[PDB]
Design a protein around this ligand. Structure first.
Ligand SMILES: N[C@@H](Cc1ccc(O)cc1)C(=O)N[C@@H](CCC(=O)O)C(=O)N[C@@H](Cc1c[nH]c2ccccc12)C(=O)O
Length: 441
């Protein structure tokens, strides 16, 4: 049949946030109970659930009568976006073996045996657990990547999907890709609690927290294709996103990192002058098998709205016109290109920060857009002159300026418009805001 129709018809539970209220929009009307300390924060598409480590921070879904998907060997899929802060070297050492659940249908410490299923975390491992009425259990243990810059449990919003085929295996997907599997054949009937609990259970780290979004459940095992579509259907483009996957915002400091070479930071030659790439330093921990380029080094940029267009939205929308500034010494300096400004072969125009030569027009009208790579939280910036003609997308060009050493200098070029289909490009940028979910060790 039709994939979109299948995804829709197979849904028996779909949590959505509207008017700051959490509820089931699947159509089955399951009751949703939000506790006092269950917080709401920016999400992949609207707001998301944020859970802290105390008993007041939880969300309970009491299943409607008709919603029975874990019947006698009935296939089912659970999906939701997830965001877990990067685990510090210390905490990894201190709480590494502490496995705690965050989502579960298992009623614990009571009359029934270990009920249905659970999603738990243990160090840098994501775990899916299935337990039947007899107490038999099956598990999928996913070990995150060593390089936290590209890891799935390192402060970025990632899409999780776990499919369960009672005649074969349980499969764990992340951003639409298979990351783990486990045969579940031989398992008997699952008799879970009529309650689906979103809460940190048995977590020894008082500072631990997580964010969960679009929690959904299907009454069938979605296939790769259906999962791919589900995943991408959430990638709306109304708003642009920062490095963590949250809505891009105005009047906010962001470090820029070129997607094409995530190893570089941005530096400024001098006020009124040009910008260029630098080698960011890395953190490495052999015994913990964890490493990553450090963040928060290099220039700090701020996005300001070009003009107020009836309504002031704190979020930057794709297509919004803006003015880019860099914060240097408690002062904000406009980024742009002055008329007749030095440029590589008259095509790659070298950007200037705080250029102020009297009598010389300085072009600064930029447009923040999302022109490619919808799965990555990157952004493109387009520069225009006073005649609203395109001076090109922002990127870099290797060369020299006077006696300075060879560098990858920040430029604006229209040349990128003829390669918008490449895997990697050069005009793609990550906007990185300081975040408590990531601190360099
Ligand atoms: N309008 C002309 C001439 C001009 C006079 C004075 C002034 O303050 C700026 C310009 C012009 O465009 N001159 C510029 C070209 C544009 C530009 O460089 O951004 C020019 O010739 N600049 C010199 C000086 C310069 C530029 N980038 C530098 C980086 C390090 C050190 C010196 C730099 C140039 O290099 O071309």
């Amino acid at each position: 049949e039709d994939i979109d129709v299948i995804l829709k018809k197979s849904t028996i539970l779909n949590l959505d946030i509207n008017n700051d209220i959490i509820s089931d929009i699947s159509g089955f009307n399951s009751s949703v109970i939000t506790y006092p300390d269950a917080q709401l924060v920016p999400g992949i598409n609207g707001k998301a659930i944020h859970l802290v480590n105390n008993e007041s921070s939880e969300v309970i879904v009491h299943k409607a009568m008709d919603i029975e998907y874990n019947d006698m060997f009935n296939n089912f899929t659970v999906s939701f976006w997830l965001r877990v802060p990067k685990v510090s070297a210390s905490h990894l050492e201190q709480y590494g073996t502490n496995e705690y659940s965050i989502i579960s249908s298992m009623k614990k410490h009571s009359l029934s045996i270990g009920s249905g299923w659970s999603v738990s975390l243990k160090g840098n491992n994501l775990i899916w657990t299935l337990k039947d009425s007899a107490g038999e259990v099956r598990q999928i243990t996913f070990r995150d990547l060593p390089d936290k810059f590209n890891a799935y449990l390192a402060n970025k919003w990632v899409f999780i999907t776990i499919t369960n085929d009672r005649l074969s295996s349980a499969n764990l997907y992340i951003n639409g890709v298979l990351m783990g599997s486990a045969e579940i054949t031989g398992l008997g009937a699952i008799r879970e609690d009529n309650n689906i609990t979103l809460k940190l259970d048995r977590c020894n780290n008082n500072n631990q927290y997580v964010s969960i979004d679009k929690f959904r459940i299907f009454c069938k095992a979605l296939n790769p294709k259906e999962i791919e579509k589900l995943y991408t259907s959430y990638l709306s483009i109304t708003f642009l996103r920062d490095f963590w996957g949250n809505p891009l915002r105005y009047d906010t400091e962001y470090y820029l990192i070129p997607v094409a070479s995530s190893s570089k930071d941005v530096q400024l030659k001098n006020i009124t002058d040009y910008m260029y790439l630098t080698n960011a330093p890395s953190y490495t921990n052999g015994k913990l098998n964890i490493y990553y380029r450090r963040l928060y080094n290099g220039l700090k940029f701020i996005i300001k709205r070009y003009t107020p267009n009836n309504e002031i939205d704190s979020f930057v929308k794709s297509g919004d016109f803006i003015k880019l500034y860099v914060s240097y010494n408690n002062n904000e300096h406009i980024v742009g290109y002055p008329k007749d400004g030095n440029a590589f072969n008259n095509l790659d125009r070298i950007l200037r920060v705080g250029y102020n030569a009297p009598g010389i027009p300085l072009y600064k009208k930029m447009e923040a857009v999302k022109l490619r790579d919808l799965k990555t939280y990157s952004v493109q910036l387009k520069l225009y002159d006073d005649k609203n003609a395109s001076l090109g997308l922002v990127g870099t060009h290797n060369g020299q300026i006077g006696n300075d050493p060879n560098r990858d200098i920040l430029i604006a070029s229209n040349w990128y418009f003829n390669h918008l289909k490449d895997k990697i490009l050069g005009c793609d940028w990550y906007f990185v805001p300081t975040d408590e979910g990531w601190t360099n060790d």
